[PDB]
Symmetry: C3
Subunit: 334 residues, 3 copies
Amino acid sequence: SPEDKELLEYLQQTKAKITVVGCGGAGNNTITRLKMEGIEGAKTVAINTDAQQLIRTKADKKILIGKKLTRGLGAGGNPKIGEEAAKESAEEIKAAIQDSDMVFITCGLGGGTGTGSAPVVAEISKKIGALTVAVVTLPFVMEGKVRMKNAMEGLERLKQHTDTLVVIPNEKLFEIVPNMPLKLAFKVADEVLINAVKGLVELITKDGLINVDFADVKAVMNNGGLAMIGIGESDSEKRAKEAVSMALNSPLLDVDIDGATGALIHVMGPEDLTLEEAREVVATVSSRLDPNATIIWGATIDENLENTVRVLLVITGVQSRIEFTDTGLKRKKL
Amino acid sequence: SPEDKELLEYLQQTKAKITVVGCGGAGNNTITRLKMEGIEGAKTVAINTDAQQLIRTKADKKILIGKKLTRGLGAGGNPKIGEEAAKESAEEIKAAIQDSDMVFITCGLGGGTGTGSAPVVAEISKKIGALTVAVVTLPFVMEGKVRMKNAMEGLERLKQHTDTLVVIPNEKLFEIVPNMPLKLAFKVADEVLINAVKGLVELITKDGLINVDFADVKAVMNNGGLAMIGIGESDSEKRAKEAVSMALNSPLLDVDIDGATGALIHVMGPEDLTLEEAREVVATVSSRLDPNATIIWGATIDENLENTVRVLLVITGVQSRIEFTDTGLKRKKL
Amino acid sequence: SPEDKELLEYLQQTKAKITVVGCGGAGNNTITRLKMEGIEGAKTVAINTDAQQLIRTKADKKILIGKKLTRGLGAGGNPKIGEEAAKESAEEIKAAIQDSDMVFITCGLGGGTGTGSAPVVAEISKKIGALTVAVVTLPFVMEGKVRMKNAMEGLERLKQHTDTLVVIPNEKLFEIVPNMPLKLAFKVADEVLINAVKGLVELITKDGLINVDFADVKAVMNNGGLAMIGIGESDSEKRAKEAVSMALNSPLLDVDIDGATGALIHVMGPEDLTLEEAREVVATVSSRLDPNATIIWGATIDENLENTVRVLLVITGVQSRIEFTDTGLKRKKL
Ligand SMILES: Nc1nc2c(ncn2[C@@H]2O[C@H](COP(=O)(O)OP(=O)(O)O)[C@@H](O)[C@H]2O)c(=O)[nH]1
Ligand SMILES: Nc1nc2c(ncn2[C@@H]2O[C@H](COP(=O)(O)OP(=O)(O)O)[C@@H](O)[C@H]2O)c(=O)[nH]1
Ligand SMILES: Nc1nc2c(ncn2[C@@H]2O[C@H](COP(=O)(O)OP(=O)(O)O)[C@@H](O)[C@H]2O)c(=O)[nH]1
């Protein structure tokens, strides 16, 4: 029977179905790059309340949300509209992430479409029973108080309908290249973003020097509460050791990780990458979290990655370590 | 791309998408006429719990609701059944008004299908984020106490899922042609209805001596609370002046309009209609509402409208001026 | 018009649309038999969280629920998973029972897919406004305390989204053939089940010596609260009298029926079945319930039913007569 045959086939699926949804201009901007630089095994869905941005975007599926609310003309920086536009198009959004086993909601918090629609796309995803993960940034302080109070509130809302929520405070990007002209500001942030997102998807989707079990990912990530990134990499010949300290020290991991469970580690390096450098990476890390943290890791080889090995680090469940003030992420004072 | 092309096209839409849903026998009866006399740019959806009436109706789309509840055999005057039949067919109803920018729910309150299903079609419409407007009548007192207590309760329910709700008390039709035999009763009511409904749709959809901005309509109507009609027209040569006083005095505007915001004014007249008579119309009106009422108006020319100019008047947000007793609309006593 | 023609046709439907949904292994097992032995006018839908069982099943439609939650690999005896798998696939489940006028949810309570998914399929059915009926069993005591505490809780949950819920305690199967080896245990239970389910469907769907009005069924069954079965049959020549006492005495009707309203009686017999034996059957029964119980009955002739007449008995609204302890159905002590 065509139903039995279909059933049989189902059992043969070997790969997890990952869909990436970018919201608003920045999120669409991100989707456009993954769609070009390629995002190993993942479909891209861009959703915007602004038709012009949506149109100049490159994605697998485009959805103009808020068609009656907005008119294809933007949400004017208003999270309330981003939200209704998304609520108004729930069906359509859900129909795009419907078959995904895992869904990543990415965007720049602070605007109206992203800040308002991300929590909506997230709650819709959770309903269809998918692994809901958000890799989202916080505005630069230069952008002002209203942009951040809005970003904060969005983060809070996004917290409730998210399995794991990865926050990247653009402000620390300045702790990485101190005298950056706002120009690069958003170009650096663009980079960090595409890394955090691609680093995570491939860690789960790209064949490495280890089989990384989606069932494990789902296990851990199912409870990443509030996670934070760490990126590091060494040109030198003591790579692993330097790439993981860089990472463990990135100003992006702006949190006290001592009391942290779960972690996802992706070491990427050239063909001369060793399962041992990977392990070095993993233990230097394991050595700093709760003694029982569940750690997911993988190791992939990157063509264009010269003599270097990057080390993406996603430390989860740090929400008790942080303070959600409507002025930003404040490292908790107990 | 077919998605981009589509997106582009979207931006070119110039006309608001209006769908008119008539519920129950009277509502279906109304839809049948708009479908014939033509309702400038608006699709008609008739929904009934009675297959026989539905069948003899003329509409763009027909929906037999309550197919399992009822069996295509009516709701026997019961609002409770009108409601479940509609709740039972929500999906189907929603699929018919799904793309509308604006939805009009029309019916004769007092029966079972209309009284029960109108609030359901209204809440469904609001969910899809459309401009939900109801042009609905109240039964004649001859019909009795049960018919009205049911109509009242329906009006209340309809209040919660409606952007603006236009009430037409058939009882005042007698204040217009005093010794009317019940025959005409429903023939007069039929007229007033088709006017209130067509007058409003064309005001928004028919090209006049002024561009009427749907964005303005949505603004005002988005808050018409409880509205009431006024119809007037003058054969004479001081038209505007006579047509707007007639209107301002119609026994149908059975409410204290002094404290009213928003209003929609549609003056229709022969080709010799002036933008000035229209303005006369509008100011005589503006002069009687809150000094800051938002007034939407338009002016269209009607072929078959001899030497006359009709003046439809929809005064909104008068709900504080009225008393909802389960015996009818009582002009509030503060 | 194709819409009018369609409407017309609708009015001509003469038969109620019955869909039977079996959940989990036992439920799928049951569906497989009705699908083969044939279930007079009823479509079969098998739903399972385990692909292997689903595949070896025979049904009109198969649905693998919990595809993201479970992975086509079972629910491991967990009701919590049976539930999420079903909640996760609500749309798909609903799309299969969507046009039914009546829906039967059948399964063996105690496992994870059935116990968890039956209440979900039931609440979904009630939403589409269908006659929701469950013919479900309770585990044998040999299976242990956890299997039953889970079955009990499922029964409770199933109570809330069910029009009438028919419980068959497998434990009393031993009061019928006392020294049964667990082998037959489940083979006897298999029989009783296929009878209770087919007996009820045909009583409503198979042409007998009486027109049984679906409108009556819906009336009664709409309020069967907690029902219990009785099966009996006589080889002899005083059939009716013996078949109805057997039935009235079956250890399966483990409840005090004196205070019971409604009942459904299906007497099946050979071609020499009399409308009078049927009436004998019905009055011996009527004589023992509340003096105003609404009794639905029918009478059908069965080819392969030698000189015998079976008598299926479904006595409804006995929930006040029973005690729901998380160790089984205890005949209430007031
Ligand atoms: N990385 C990155 N962030 C951006 C970019 N443009 C804007 N943002 C950030 O994202 C936030 C929202 O901007 P935008 O994406 O335009 O918002 P929306 O379209 O209204 O949802 C801002 O507060 C910025 O910090 C961009 O090109 N790259
Ligand atoms: N204008 C108008 N009103 C009607 C007509 N028939 C009934 N009504 C009114 O509408 C109410 C409901 O009647 P009907 O449309 O038959 O109700 P339903 O079909 O049961 O929902 C009555 O109480 C009447 O006042 C009609 O032909 N024209
Ligand atoms: N009649 C019958 N009952 C069964 C059969 N297998 C299991 N059961 C009963 O149904 C309950 C659930 O078993 P199963 O159908 O495997 O559960 P599930 O697949 O996990 O939902 C058990 O506790 C048994 O009492 C069978 O073949 N026939």
